[PDB]
Design an enzyme around this catalytic site. Sequence first.
Site, PDB file in Angstrom:
ATOM      1  N   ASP A  38     -91.591 -60.771 -42.354  1.00 47.50           N
ATOM      2  CA  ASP A  38     -90.501 -60.160 -43.496  1.00 47.50           C
ATOM      3  C   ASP A  38     -89.394 -59.230 -42.681  1.00 47.50           C
ATOM      4  OD1 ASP A  38     -89.422 -59.582 -45.543  1.00 47.50           O
ATOM      5  OD2 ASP A  38     -90.892 -59.077 -46.950  1.00 47.50           O
ATOM      6  N   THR A  39     -88.503 -59.845 -42.203  1.00 46.14           N
ATOM      7  CA  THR A  39     -87.442 -59.035 -41.491  1.00 46.14           C
ATOM      8  C   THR A  39     -86.704 -58.123 -42.543  1.00 46.14           C
ATOM      9  OG1 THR A  39     -85.658 -60.786 -41.672  1.00 46.14           O
ATOM     10  CG2 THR A  39     -87.079 -60.471 -39.791  1.00 46.14           C
ATOM     11  N   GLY A  40     -86.814 -58.371 -43.821  1.00 42.99           N
ATOM     12  CA  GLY A  40     -86.043 -57.620 -44.811  1.00 42.99           C
ATOM     13  C   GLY A  40     -86.905 -56.562 -45.434  1.00 42.99           C
TER      14      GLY A  40
END
EC number: 3.4.23.16
Lengths: 99, 99
Positions: B25-27
């Site tokens: 999950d880069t966000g």
Amino acid sequence: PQITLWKRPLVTIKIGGQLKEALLDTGADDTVIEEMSLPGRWKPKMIGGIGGFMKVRQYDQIIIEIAGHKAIGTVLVGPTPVNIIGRNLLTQIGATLNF
Amino acid sequence: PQITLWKRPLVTIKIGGQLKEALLDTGADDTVIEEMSLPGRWKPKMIGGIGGFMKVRQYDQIIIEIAGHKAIGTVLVGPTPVNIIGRNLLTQIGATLNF
Ligand SMILES: CC(C)(C)NC(=O)[C@@H]1C[C@@H]2CCCC[C@@H]2CN1C[C@@H](O)[C@H](Cc1ccccc1)NC(=O)[C@H](CC(N)=O)NC(=O)c1ccc2ccccc2n1
Ligand SMILES: [Cl-]
Ligand SMILES: [Cl-]
Ligand SMILES: [Cl-]
């Protein structure tokens, strides 16, 4: 580019003639942008994440530039705290995760 | 590996002796795991996302194996419907976003 993750992966987007900052988010199915005017009709959608649900306006086939890369696709508009570029548009710009 | 984004980027993790599925999950600033016991001390935290805030327990210095790659860091535990590996641990496995 190759973007590391020591900081939030924020980029400039261009939508409706306007520049905005947005987060490249592999965890998001959808792209969600703060309240703005977009052309055409919209459809209803309910999205969910970490603190519960949010009603948004779904606009289809919207032209959007992401870090200089052109996409045309679905943008959800609503009271999001951060503009999020989700997988529907990350795939249009050819993004992958690598390790 | 290279992970495309047509589908959710789910991988197997080992945490607390348990195998789980989790989203890369880069966000997400933080790593958030569904309710489970972990050893050691914890403190309460409120984390934000779409929809508002969630109350979680913060455990520090937790080892996790993510797709075979060992890392250590802070893990938040709470009523998330999806286990998320956020940037605090993605950096440790050398994950980058590429386009
Ligand atoms: C955007 C939407 C399409 C609704 N998708 C999601 O929200 C899915 C929902 C999934 C099921 C619930 C558990 C989380 C996963 C992953 N999320 C994506 C996921 O990437 C999500 C996107 C996001 C970022 C910023 C602000 C809001 C929302 N991140 C998060 O929820 C993380 C959680 C955390 N505190 O680490 N939030 C943040 O990292 C974060 C950063 C800055 C902020 C500023 C103001 C308010 C909130 C802020 N939240
Ligand atoms: Cl789309
Ligand atoms: Cl950490
Ligand atoms: Cl690095």
